[PDB]
Amino acid sequence: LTPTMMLYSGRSQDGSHLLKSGRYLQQELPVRIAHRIKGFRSLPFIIGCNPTILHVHELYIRAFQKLTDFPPIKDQADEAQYCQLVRQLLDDHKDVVTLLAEGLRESRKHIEDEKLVRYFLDKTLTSRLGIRMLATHHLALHEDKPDFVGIICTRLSPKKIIEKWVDFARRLCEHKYGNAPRVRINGHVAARFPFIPMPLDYILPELLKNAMRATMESHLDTPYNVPDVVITIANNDVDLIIRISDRGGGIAHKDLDRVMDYHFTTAGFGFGLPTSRAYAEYLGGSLQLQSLQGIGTDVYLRLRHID
Amino acid sequence: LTPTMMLYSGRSQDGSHLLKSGRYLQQELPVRIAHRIKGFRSLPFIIGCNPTILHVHELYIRAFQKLTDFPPIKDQADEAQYCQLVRQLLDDHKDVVTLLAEGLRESRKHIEDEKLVRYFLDKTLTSRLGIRMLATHHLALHEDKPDFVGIICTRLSPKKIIEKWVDFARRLCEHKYGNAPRVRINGHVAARFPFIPMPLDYILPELLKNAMRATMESHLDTPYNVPDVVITIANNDVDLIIRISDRGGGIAHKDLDRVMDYHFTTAGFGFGLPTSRAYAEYLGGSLQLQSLQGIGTDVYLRLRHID
Ligand SMILES: Nc1ncnc2c1ncn2[C@@H]1O[C@H](COP(=O)(O)OP(=O)(O)NP(=O)(O)O)[C@@H](O)[C@H]1O
Ligand SMILES: Nc1ncnc2c1ncn2[C@@H]1O[C@H](COP(=O)(O)OP(=O)(O)NP(=O)(O)O)[C@@H](O)[C@H]1O
Ligand SMILES: O=C(O)[C@@H](Cl)Cc1ccccc1
Ligand SMILES: O=C(O)[C@@H](Cl)Cc1ccccc1
Ligand SMILES: [K+]
Ligand SMILES: [K+]
Ligand SMILES: [Mg+2]
Ligand SMILES: [Mg+2]
């Protein structure tokens, strides 16, 4: 399970579990989308009038209409068509973070309660993650993948998923700078346990891109020889901790109280850190920074295990 | 300068700076000791009645009496005798932390506001540190040491002072376990800057003893081969950061919210962490912990530079 939301682990050769899951989504999705729409309705007028914000507001209204127009699921044929709707919505909404980032960029500067936008984005993006997790889990229940129950991996290796995003981040970095730091991984490198990959897929590349950028920009004279990024995995009975340590110079004292703000960037829209922290906390984890100004930064991602 | 307190850097071949410093102490010390006595008077009755607490309470009353009985300093002869008094008090009060630790151990368990004892100890021990710093600075103004203005070092090497306490902590550890982790020091190893050693002399051995203990107790099967403790020095224009990282297994989740409490220990009286944090914060710095349960702990000491 996740916040106020359960990921069904059920199984059935008759397929009765798919119907129960689908009926659950049918009950749950319209209510959560309605909460998002209320979020839009309460946005400060001048922000809500932004055409890009209006577009996203309308997307959610359409989603609500489609979800509520769909008849109650009674058989596999109904459930099958519901999945088509769910797939369409997942796709129609895939650029929502980007659209909100852009819609909010300028319009936020008007109102003076800066807490409002942070609150709306935390609430909106985490609810969205939860919705996409539930929806994707349902679809995945149809899949035949070993080591997976829906989107839940029954034996996830933290080292493997980290290496996947390391390779991705390294490619982006090389394309921009001509090279990328090597990454070393230490600690509980052989750990395997049940876990939902999706949050890691969102968070890890954000933290890795940050570490690599900082490392390259502080070693412009020696791009062919930069300090490794060092990742430590700690696996205990309560949580999984992933520490990502770089020698990229640290986060400056003058920037320290701003790096967690949406739209703050020293370079994207400056979303990597605030979104990653909102997601971690939404799931009962946390994201903490330790800056060693002049040396580097340690970032600690903590995510709870599955009970 | 330090909190509401200035360490005089003055100089004079006539020695007029010693008189000005001494008169400053004469003004300042009785007032601060009076505040400590008020602290004792406000302690919960049942704690204040403890014979060891009463003994310390009386020590401070005697100090106040001696300080206020001393006539106004007018010449070098007066100043010279005042230093004798200051030396006597520094010596008479050298075991105060220990006496308070013991006096408070049981008696604190009676009252239910646990915040009270923490507050009294933070306030009492930091004020005491400040007093001992001011007093020792004054005495040291008579000394002829190169690279020192009183207790202020004009070119302190963080690496050197760390190595001094490493050797000390390693000896204690070897005596208890038969071996000690090696310590590596990296980062700004060649840094030198004006700094007051005294807080580092209090804090560093406390953090090093913790790291070494944890390392030895988690490697009982291989005491002859344990993970190094790794210390990173970061020196910037705002602060000095010293990170002490061990592979001693971490601080358990169940203990995490208690390790900063006076008297909490899994083994002294459990004072190393709460005192070290109070001292750091008293000076405008901080002490932060990052636990990787199952792996180790990172401890970050931050102390502000001298303006
Ligand atoms: N490991 C790091 N070292 C140094 N600076 C960092 C580090 N991580 C983040 N920062 C700084 O923190 C700022 C904000 O980070 P972030 O929220 O991820 O947005 P961004 O990287 O600038 N753009 P985005 O692609 O949206 O994530 C960065 O722009 C940097 O100035
Ligand atoms: N680096 C560490 N790794 C694991 N546990 C630690 C570490 N540092 C502190 N602790 C734990 O934190 C507790 C409290 O620390 P502390 O305040 O320094 O008191 P103490 O070491 O037990 N006794 P004292 O000699 O008075 O300092 C310890 O007893 C340990 O259980
Ligand atoms: O904004 C999104 O990505 C989500 Cl909330 C769109 C969606 C709604 C309902 C079901 C699946 C996806
Ligand atoms: O408790 C202490 O160590 C200090 Cl406050 C005693 C003292 C008082 C005054 C001057 C010097 C030392
Ligand atoms: K940001
Ligand atoms: K303690
Ligand atoms: Mg980023
Ligand atoms: Mg200790």
Swiss-Prot record, chains A, B:
The modification N6-acetyllysine is found at residues 123, 164. Autophosphorylated. Its main location: mitochondrion. It catalyses: L-seryl-[3-methyl-2-oxobutanoate dehydrogenase] + ATP = O-phospho-L-seryl-[3-methyl-2-oxobutanoate dehydrogenase] + ADP + H(+); L-seryl-[protein] + ATP = O-phospho-L-seryl-[protein] + ADP + H(+). It comes from the Eukaryota. Belongs to the PDK/BCKDK protein kinase family. This is Branched-chain alpha-ketoacid dehydrogenase kinase. It comes from Rattus norvegicus. The chain holds residues 70 to 404 of 412 of the full protein.
